[PDB]
């Protein structure tokens with residue numbers, strides 16, 4: 001059963017073998033029946049794990065080993081690559097079958113991809129399989145696992161501590177710890193180091209290049225933000241979960257703020273817990289969690305950002321894809337209201353890719369008719385848009401040979417929320433990329 005007008009949700013529990021056992025079964029059938037197929041991985045790390053599982057099968061990897069093949073049937077790329085080529089003039093094949101792994105990923109690109117795909121199925125042109133243990137709207141934070149898990153609600157620290165949390169360091173196994181922000185992770189990683197622990201810190205931006213150290217290095221703690229929910233694999237016996245995240249929120253339609261950490265969805269909680277309990281020979285991995293879950297995530301900027309991407313993907317004349325139905329009421333918008341014309345869309349795409357700016361911010365710049373390399377907007381905003389570093393106004397040497405205070409016309413706190421984010425924006429403002 002692969003060629004019909006239907007979207008299948010494959011929702012086996014974490015570790016049941018969606019990526020390693022089921023996926024190759026589908027690819028083999030799609031190859032056999034000559035079905036133009038795309039496989040969508042959330043990250044390059046998952047893409048490499050798919051390659052091990054798919055070795056032997058004719059798959060065209062559109063990901064950074066590629067050897068020429070006369071078989072053109074199954075493509076594999078990241079969610080974000082898929083959506084990006086759909087925004088670009090580059091021609092994306094009209095696949096008969098879409099296979100989305102980790103189809104709960106809530107990056108705006110993944111959300112937009114699911115909207116595009118569900119619209120193609122809804123119109124009779126394709127089939128689709130969404131692989132995820134935690135489909136949108138699940139209220140089960142404690143699904144089944146391969147091995148029994150010990151769940152404990154505790155007070156989870158979010159700052160350095162002197163006393164009160166001895167159970168954290170009095171543990172000899174390996175721990176994955178989900179923190180509410182990169183800054184909080186830094187402060188916690190320094191406390192754990194002080195106590196004689198070996199700590200690796202991961203975030204979404206560093207995940208691709210630094211996750212590999214968790215396999216070629218000795219560690220006691222992985223201190224990380226929510227990137228590791230989707231398909232990160234550690235050999236850990238314990239997960240510590242604050243169950244909270246900073247959330248980017250559009251305030252008064254004019255700016256994005258990072259709103260003070262707010263509980264995660266049951267799906268996120270389930271996915272974090274799902275990093276352990278995966279080995280049937282090891283009962284009693286521990287899931288220690290800091291608070292409750294909430295499904296009130298409509299204030300997250302990524303729902304509107306997904307509409308901004310989807311308004312810019314052509315399907316047929318006068319038709320704009322809707323969000324995947326379980327995600328469609330998360331955002332109030334006018335369909336098409338973010339559609340840019342051809343040259344501004346180009347700028348939008350390039351501000352998001354080489355510029356490395358959040359979708360919301362790239363949209364403000366592109367739709368103002370600013371070209372990609374014109375950085376005068378990073379300095380000409382209102383004084384409440386002044387970016388601080390070490391409690392003083394940040395400054396850069398501009399491409400016009402002047403020292404200017406960083407003061408963007410549109411303010412998005414995600415570009416100055418941590419040291420790495422701000423360094424990156426400072427180089428963008430100076431014209432260095």
Ligand SMILES: Nc1ncnc2c1ncn2[C@@H]1O[C@H](COP(=O)(O)OP(=O)(O)O)[C@@H](O)[C@H]1O
Pocket residue numbers: 012013014015016017018019020021146233278279280
């Ligand atoms: N490199 C590996 N070698 C052997 N077993 C693995 C490896 N990676 C994962 N597994 C195990 O295979 C099972 C299925 O994993 P996976 O297909 O990723 O599950 P799912 O996609 O359903 O979350 C899990 O028990 C996992 O621990």
Ligand SMILES: [Mn+2]
Pocket residue numbers: 018019101102231
């Ligand atoms: Mn998987």
